[PDB]
Amino acid sequence: SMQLNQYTLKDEIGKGSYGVVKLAYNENDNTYYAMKVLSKKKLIRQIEQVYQEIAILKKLDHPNVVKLVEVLDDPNEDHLYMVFELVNQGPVMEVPTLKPLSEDQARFYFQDLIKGIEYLHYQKIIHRDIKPSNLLVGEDGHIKIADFGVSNEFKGSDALLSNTVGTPAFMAPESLSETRKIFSGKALDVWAMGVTLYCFVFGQCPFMDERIMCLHSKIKSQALEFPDQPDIAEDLKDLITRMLDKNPESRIVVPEIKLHPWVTR
Ligand SMILES: COc1cc(N2CCC(N(C)C)CC2)ccc1Nc1ncc(Cl)c(Nc2ccccc2P(C)(C)=O)n1
Known part of the structure; x- marks a missing residue:
């Protein structure tokens, strides 16, 4: 479980378009977060898609919208980290599924x-x-x-x-x-x-x-x-x-x- 500042990264919980999303335990807080880990090498080859999303997320505060808590952007490192509040039950469903909601x-x-x-x-x-x-x-x-x-x-x-x-x-x-x-x-x-x-x-x-x-x-x-x-x-x-x-x-x-x-x- 790689340590990054206050956080200890645990299992991968999924992937987005670029990078991975990891469960992360915070030692300052004694609570879990979702951490999006992006490689800037891989984004510089194919984003400015990352910094617009960040600018949007910073404006957004609603109990039905994911909360971005912090961005770890070192100019002299390759990885860019984005820390979200963990939404602990995961997606509402997988599609297709034989067991739909009522x-x-x-x-x-x-x-x-x-x-x-x-x-x-x-x-x-x-x-x-x-x-x-x-x-x-x-x-x-x-x-x-x-x-x-x-x-x-x-x-x-x-x-x-x-x-x-x-x-x-x-x-x-x-x-x-x-x-x-x-x-x-x-x-x-x-x-x-x-x-x-x-x-x-x-x-x-x-x-x-x-x-x-x-x-x-x-x-x-x-x-x-x-x-x-x-x-x-x-x-x-x-x-x-x-x-x-x-x-x-x-x-x-x-x-x-x-x-x-x-x-x-
Ligand atoms: C226990 O928490 C979660 C668990 C899971 N799963 C656990 C394993 C299951 N299967 C494979 C056994 C699949 C669902 C998914 C999400 C969260 N929680 C969660 N909270 C906050 C965020 Cl920002 C988040 N992001 C995320 C995670 C995975 C994929 C994609 C994103 P996004 C929609 C940002 O692109 N995920």
């Missing part, structure tokens, strides 16, 4: 997600990678939105984007055009919340293919189909359908989601 467990987490995304949208942040593996379950049973590695900070009431980033299964149709286009960033987040809620209760994504262009094609043009098992309520089917509206103009928005009967019952 409708009631899904609602609980979905309410937390609304609260978190609403905060993020209020702070003028589009997450751009909302999915179950980025939603970490804490001590209290609540979720914290994690991984701001591709998020975008905007000026104005919405972000107006053209670049395609994120996880393909949760990308909205308006973002998958062959020609360059411009699309609302908030509506992207909402579509991803809908694919997320679909996963919560069915344990798989609504559109899936290993082939990227077959996936894009289904996202853009395949109608939403619900399986026979599980049998989910019609109020839930309506909310998912409204979030996975392929037209970003008519797609439901976060203020409307909050007032939806599946949410408020």
Whole structure:
């Protein structure tokens, strides 16, 4: 267990895009943290993606958002460390899974997600990678939105984007055009919340293919189909359908989601 300042690094708990995430025990505090360990050699070969994320994380203080506690950036060392509050239960689920959440467990987490995304949208942040593996379950049973590695900070009431980033299964149709286009960033987040809620209760994504262009094609043009098992309520089917509206103009928005009967019952 390598020691770095006050911390003692224990097992790897996962990997992000670059580097590793390790459980870390703090000797000053007598408590555990999650430490993202990044190699600057490896980031200098392929980030400025690291320092924007850090600038975003420093602005963010909400019980449904992961908390960045400190950055250890030595100019004359290779490693850059990023220390987060540990969210001790890990992700809300693995996808695909044969054991999806119940409708009631899904609602609980979905309410937390609304609260978190609403905060993020209020702070003028589009997450751009909302999915179950980025939603970490804490001590209290609540979720914290994690991984701001591709998020975008905007000026104005919405972000107006053209670049395609994120996880393909949760990308909205308006973002998958062959020609360059411009699309609302908030509506992207909402579509991803809908694919997320679909996963919560069915344990798989609504559109899936290993082939990227077959996936894009289904996202853009395949109608939403619900399986026979599980049998989910019609109020839930309506909310998912409204979030996975392929037209970003008519797609439901976060203020409307909050007032939806599946949410408020
Ligand atoms: C006991 O705590 C955790 C445990 C686990 N697992 C433990 C082994 C399981 N399997 C393989 C047996 C898989 C889940 C995952 C996360 C946390 N907690 C946690 N708290 C805070 C953070 Cl910032 C965090 N980051 C993290 C960890 C792994 C992967 C990716 C990120 P991000 C979303 C930042 O990119 N993780």
